[PDB]
Amino acid sequence: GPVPSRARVYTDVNTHRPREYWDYESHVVEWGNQDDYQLVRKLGRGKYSEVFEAINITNNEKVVVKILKPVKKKKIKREIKILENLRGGPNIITLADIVKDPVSRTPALVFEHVNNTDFKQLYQTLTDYDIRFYMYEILKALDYCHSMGIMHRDVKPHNVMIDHEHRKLRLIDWGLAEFYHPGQEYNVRVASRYFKGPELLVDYQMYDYSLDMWSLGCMLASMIFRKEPFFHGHDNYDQLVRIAKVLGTEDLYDYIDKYNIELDPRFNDILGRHSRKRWERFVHSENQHLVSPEALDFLDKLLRYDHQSRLTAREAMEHPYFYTVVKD
Numbered sequence: 226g227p228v229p230s231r232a233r234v235y236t237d238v239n240t241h242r243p244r245e246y247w248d249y250e251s252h253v254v255e256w257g258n259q260d261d262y263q264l265v266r267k268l269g270r271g272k273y274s275e276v277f278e279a280i281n282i283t284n285n286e287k288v289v290v291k292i293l294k295p296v297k298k299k300k301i302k303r304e305i306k307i308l309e310n311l312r313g314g315p316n317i318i319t320l321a322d323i324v325k326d327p328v329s330r331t332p333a334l335v336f337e338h339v340n341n342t343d344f345k346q347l348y349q350t351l352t353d354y355d356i357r358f359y360m361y362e363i364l365k366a367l368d369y370c371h372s373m374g375i376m377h378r379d380v381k382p383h384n385v386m387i388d389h390e391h392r393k394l395r396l397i398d399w400g401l402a403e404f405y406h407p408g409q410e411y412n413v414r415v416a417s418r419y420f421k422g423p424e425l426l427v428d429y430q431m432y433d434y435s436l437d438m439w440s441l442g443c444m445l446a447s448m449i450f451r452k453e454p455f456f457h458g459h460d461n462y463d464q465l466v467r468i469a470k471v472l473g474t475e476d477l478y479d480y481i482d483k484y485n486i487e488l489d490p491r492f493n494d495i496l497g498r499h500s501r502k503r504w505e506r507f508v509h510s511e512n513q514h515l516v517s518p519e520a521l522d523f524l525d526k527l528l529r530y531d532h533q534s535r536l537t538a539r540e541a542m543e544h545p546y547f548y549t550v551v552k553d
């Protein structure tokens with residue numbers, strides 16, 4: 226069968242936590258008062274929730290209310306426990322309250338308000354320094370949740386709220402996040418298509434925190450090369466082919482051979498043979514000001530087939546790419 230895999234960092238953190246910490250099924254939700262919050266306007270509907278801007282009339286402060294769509298109280302408690310565990314951490318969205326919505330008859334998560342401009346216009350105006358700055362901020366968030374035994378599993382521009390004016394950043398939507406337990410097999414149907422790690426695309430279930438680092442690499446590639454998204458697959462199969470046209474097919478086979486994985490035979494007539502490309506290939510006159518040897522080496526160390534070979538969040542923060550970023 227498939228060769229087992231372990232996270233190379235924070236492997237045993239949940240093993241030595243009290244079971245209270247990771248056993249989210251047994252979590253007892255403490256409900257606030259739903260009348261404290263008045264909905265102002267709808268911000269968006271996802272597959273799992275509707276998101277509203279609201280006001281807490283007990284302090285006249287803006288909040289974000291996420292009213293969950295009906296789903297397993299499995300996944301509801303999971304997001305809630307993860308949010309409470311990570312509360313107070315660097316650039317983690319802050320869960321302020323949990324109330325029961327009288328209309329949906331589902332939980333409504335109440336978050337700190339953060340003032341976001343969309344990633345689409347924002348990513349077109351980001352300077353070289355801005356990209357490095359915000360990447361460092363994301364890494365703080367990723368290193369923290371990983372250190373707390375949690376992988377996000379849905380890292381993408383949509384889930385990174387940026388207040389460009391106050392240069393503040395928040396990682397949001399922890400509804401797909403999970404606890405890492407060594408040797409545990411996970412659902413491969415996570416993350417969004419363009420940001421799915423190769424482990425997901427070859428259906429390798431024993432993944433870990435390193436999944437988040439591939440997704441982050443995809444984001445970085447889209448930013449410094451100014452191509453959103455970078456790997457633009459039409460489906461989950463074409464997605465792996467897109468990646469293979471850059472990282473090459475030989476290292477792809479090295480990867481699945483290492484873990485004794487078999488590709489879906491439908492790849493037989495679409496995968497072909499491809500050499501690994503040098504990242505300079507994607508540099509042109511309109512993005513070159515965002516590119517540096519440091520930028521490419523960092524990107525290169527994130528985008529690895531082998532999840533065990535990618536930089537950890539902590540290692541990433543040690544990278545020379547962030548030397549120019551002013552530290553606090």
Ligand SMILES: O=c1oc2cc(O)ccc2c2oc3cc(O)ccc3c12
Pocket residue numbers: 268269276289291318336338339340341386397398399400
């Ligand atoms: O769309 C969202 O989905 C979320 C999901 C979460 O789990 C937590 C927070 C948010 C969240 O905060 C915001 C602030 C804004 O100014 C605009 C949109 C959002 C927004």
